[PDB]
Amino acid sequence: ESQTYEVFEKDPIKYSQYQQAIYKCLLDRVPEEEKDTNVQVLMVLGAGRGPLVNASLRAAKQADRRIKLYAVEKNPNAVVTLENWQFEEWGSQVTVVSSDMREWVAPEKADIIVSELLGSFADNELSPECLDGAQHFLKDDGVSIPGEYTSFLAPISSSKLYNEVRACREKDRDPEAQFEMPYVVRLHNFHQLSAPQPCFTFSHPNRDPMIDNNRYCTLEFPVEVNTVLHGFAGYFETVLYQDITLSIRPETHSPGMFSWFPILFPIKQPITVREGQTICVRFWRCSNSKKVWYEWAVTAPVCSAIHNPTGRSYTIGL
């Protein structure tokens, strides 16, 4: 909806980071001698209402470099905003494309592809699948902004959140479905039981012959207090370009950036944990041609059931 895009646009830190990354990449690709002749092809993949298109334009003026823009957007309602901005302000420099980036036949190849397809668990909005499908129209020496992203997990204790998740039981569905799905939540009345550890990583472009976005991770969390495990908090980190990053992981959290709250992966049954014990968790990223999903289980100090098997309770549509 229009107001979800408006909410994204209220975060100036996120766009100033994207602009700084594009500004740095343009200077590395085009030297001073070529500044007036060399026109860099830039494709904003998932342009929304256009704040990244404006960030790329400000970056090019800052870098004193020439750019040719393509603004790709599948949402036809956001395309209304885009085509009105293009006609009134952008002009011929910007070509608005109403298409899925995976289906789009590009007239030219891109020097830089820019996107913001990241969820609170980084890859949970299917940024790897989208970018993999758009990869073919990027030049051989082409750059993807973001270049990389990494998700993080941390075990948490919160009897309040366990009670909140429990209350999400619904009519006409599995009576325990609410425990087998993640929740975006500003975690408040909780306790982080161990330091966050990396879970899944993705790189762009994906210069690998055996492209597989499926993953299986085993995490060992040392616990120093007696407690109850109610779930896992998820965060992410991303490399836009070189040293220009974005983070929601608490120890490296990007100052004043509110675009993403943490994610919560619940467990069906609370697990007693003694001081000195290790929490062991297993997370899987799974897929088929139509859906992507997560599966998870605790194997230590005690076993849980495998949560969300075959994406029976929660899926991310392709």
Binding site: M210, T218, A297, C303, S304, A305, I306, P309, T310, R312
Partner: protein, 306 residues
């Protein structure tokens, strides 16, 4: 007594089935794909290996696939391998074999629990279960005593543990327990309990008491030889057979003939002898027959008219 023959070598399906039926067996546990035929699913040129991938479903009638055959997972399939390439080829091969079993309409399929970490095996099995209905059983092959715990003390610089480890002697029960907890107590997942030459201490055995044991695997190697040269069992092994007969488990004979002078059917003849000579059931056991673990609503003769 319901008996099955376990084999890992089937040159011809019809001839093997026929020889096994002639011995007096009710069923055959066998590989559904050649146990040495490792398959590649990602890397060229081996992923493009010309077919057929296995033998035809047309070699047996549908009734024979449904009643006489228990399927077996290929021994190279290692979903919990530390090598990613081995893990991914193993996941794809596990699905392919389980799917071929479902295609055949097999009544049961054997999967081993031969190590502590079977998390990914559990995950691949749970996903298979949540793809259709099938009703088909999964028999988890788990020994009373782990192979690391029954090895000969013949490694001079790595001796066997001569210290009693109460909870450690019970390690295979924990392998089963974690597996079935991960799989969320599926009614389709049961135990195929493998009996060893030396029975563990009582505590280790009765850990399995209220567990869903559907089969008991008897290696030919655990049998002693009597005066006439026939295969027999120790008195303690006989005690365990009688407890397993009370649970109505299916008995599986595995391994080669270790009593060469005798016909192989002598292992089964002995088992059938023990079944025939089991302690008889009392008037209560006779009345209760058919009601074993069958749940009923307690009668309310005050509230209802009987």
């Amino acid at each position: 007594v319901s008996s099955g023959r376990d084999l890992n070598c089937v040159p011809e399906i019809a001839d093997t089935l026929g020889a096994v039926a002639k011995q007096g067996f009710d069923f055959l546990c066998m590989p559904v794909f050649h146990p040495r035929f490792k398959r590649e699913f990602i890397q060229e040129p081996a992923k493009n290996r010309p077919g057929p991938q296995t033998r035809s479903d047309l070699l047996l009638s549908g009734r024979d696939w449904n009643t006489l055959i228990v399927g077996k997972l290929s021994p190279w399939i290692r979903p919990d391998s530390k090598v990613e390439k081995i893990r991914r080829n193993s996941e794809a091969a596990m699905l392919q074999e389980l799917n071929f079993g479902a295609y055949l309409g097999l009544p049961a399929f054997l999967l081993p629990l031969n190590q502590e970490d079977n998390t990914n095996l559990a995950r691949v099995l749970t996903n298979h279960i949540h793809t259709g209905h099938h009703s088909s059983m999964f028999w988890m092959r788990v020994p009373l005593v782990a192979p690391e715990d029954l090895r000969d003390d013949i490694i001079e610089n790595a001796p066997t543990t001569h210290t009693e480890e109460y909870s450690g002697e019970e390690k295979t029960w924990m392998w089963w327990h974690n597996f079935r907890t991960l799989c969320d107590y599926s009614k389709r997942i049961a135990v195929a309990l493998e009996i060893g030459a030396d029975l563990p201490s009582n505590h280790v055995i009765d850990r399995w008491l209220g567990e869903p044991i559907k089969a008991a695997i008897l290696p030919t190697s655990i049998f002693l030889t009597n005066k006439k040269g026939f295969p027999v069992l120790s008195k303690m092994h006989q005690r365990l057979i009688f407890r397993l007969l009370k649970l109505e488990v299916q008995f599986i004979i595995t391994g080669t003939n270790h009593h060469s002078e005798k016909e192989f059917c002598s292992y089964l003849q002995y088992l059938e002898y023990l079944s025939q000579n089991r302690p008889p059931p009392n008037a209560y056991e006779l009345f209760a027959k058919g009601y074993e673990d069958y749940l009923q609503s307690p009668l309310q003769p005050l509230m209802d008219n009987l």
